[PDB]
């Protein structure tokens, strides 16, 4: 049978890939980073508390200038805050209140929203009338939208629940490229610092490295035992970290093309909703369903601190560009900034 022959070929190729991956493993990160001094205890205190949302907060993104911030809640509101003074710069009402996404343009002129309506809405902030209009409404996905990650003022990526990713040209309003290959829902996105590649992590417990300019998968990383909800690049763009539903973070390496480190503890059993990296790449911050966040020494896997100030699940987590502060947003409609 030709189908049987193709299945045997696929199995043989998977075995060859596994053997090649094994043959290039001589040591481990835990066996190499064994003589460096531990970071110690990372103690952080809340310095701002941004209130005003009246429902669960589902996403949040920092501004490139590290002062302005955007948050999306399920009461049908996108709020743009000035973190230094806690003032409400903007408040945008949404056509559909089922929103779990936020994106801030690198230039700062646009914001992007998406949710259960399968539509990516692009809002223009700098108008000649003092308003915030809906610049675009990109449609074409057949499942809910979960991450945007603006590229330029005219290019946007999208990850949706129909097991596909897309690259859209905003001006024309149509899909430029489509990335396929996942066998389950996709809830993640993270672009490389140079914005030529990106990674997605889906619900089939696998992550994929896509090339933006060619629309084809390069590498696939496995190892998790449940759905993946978070993903982020290492600052130098040569490794990434994933968070899933089995109470475990995992650091994978692009060049060696295999897993590097596992971050887990015995008395943690909940899921992980967010993942972010410190400015130097030494601290890994992960928000859990225990209503709090944990800090892991990225090179030794030892827990270095706990941020517990929320009365419900921690759903969004981010770090400023210059690494001054970390913002966490939870389902009690409160954002907190820790320094």
């Amino acid at each position: 049978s030709e189908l049987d022959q193709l299945r045997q070929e696929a199995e043989q190729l998977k075995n060859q890939i596994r053997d090649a991956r094994k043959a290039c493993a001589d040591a481990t990160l835990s066996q190499i980073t064994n003589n460096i001094d531990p970071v110690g205890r990372i103690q952080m205190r809340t310095r701002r508390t941004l209130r005003g949302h009246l429902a669960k907060i589902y996403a949040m993104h920092w501004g490139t200038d590290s002062r302005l911030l955007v948050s999306a809640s399920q009461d049908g509101k996108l709020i743009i805050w000035d973190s230094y003074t806690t003032n409400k710069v903007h408040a945008i009402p949404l056509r559909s209140s089922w929103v779990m996404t936020c994106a801030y343009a690198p230039s700062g002129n646009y914001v992007a929203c998406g949710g259960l309506d399968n539509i990516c809405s692009i809002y223009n902030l700098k108008t000649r009338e003092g308003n915030v209009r809906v610049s675009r409404e990109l449609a074409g996905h057949t499942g809910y939208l979960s991450c945007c990650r603006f590229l330029d003022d005219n290019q946007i990526v999208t990850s949706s629940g129909d097991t596909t990713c897309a690259l859209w040209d905003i001006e024309t309003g149509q899909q430029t490229t489509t990335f396929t290959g996942h066998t389950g829902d996709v809830m993640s996105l993270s672009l490389a610092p140079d914005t030529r590649l990106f990674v997605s992590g889906a619900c089939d417990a696998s992550a994929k490295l896509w090339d933006v300019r060619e629309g084809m998968c390069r590498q696939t990383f496995t190892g998790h035992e449940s759905d993946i909800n978070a993903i982020c690049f290492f600052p130098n763009g040569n490794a990434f970290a994933t968070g899933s539903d089995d109470a475990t973070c995992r650091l994978f390496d692009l060049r060696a093309d295999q897993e590097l480190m596992t971050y887990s503890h015995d008395n943690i059993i909940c899921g992980i909703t967010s993942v972010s990296f410190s400015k130097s790449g030494r601290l890994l911050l992960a928000g859990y369903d225990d209503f709090n966040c944990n800090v892991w020494d990225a090179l030794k896997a030892d827990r270095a601190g706990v941020l517990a100030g929320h009365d419900n699940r921690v759903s969004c987590l981010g770090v400023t560009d210059d690494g001054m502060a970390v913002a966490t947003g939870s389902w009690d409609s409160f954002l907190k900034i820790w320094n």
Binding site: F291, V306, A308, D311
Partner: peptide
């Protein structure tokens, strides 16, 4: 109970 839970953690 929320205060006690936060203090314990």
């Amino acid at each position: 109970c929320s205060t006690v839970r936060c203090k314990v953690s």
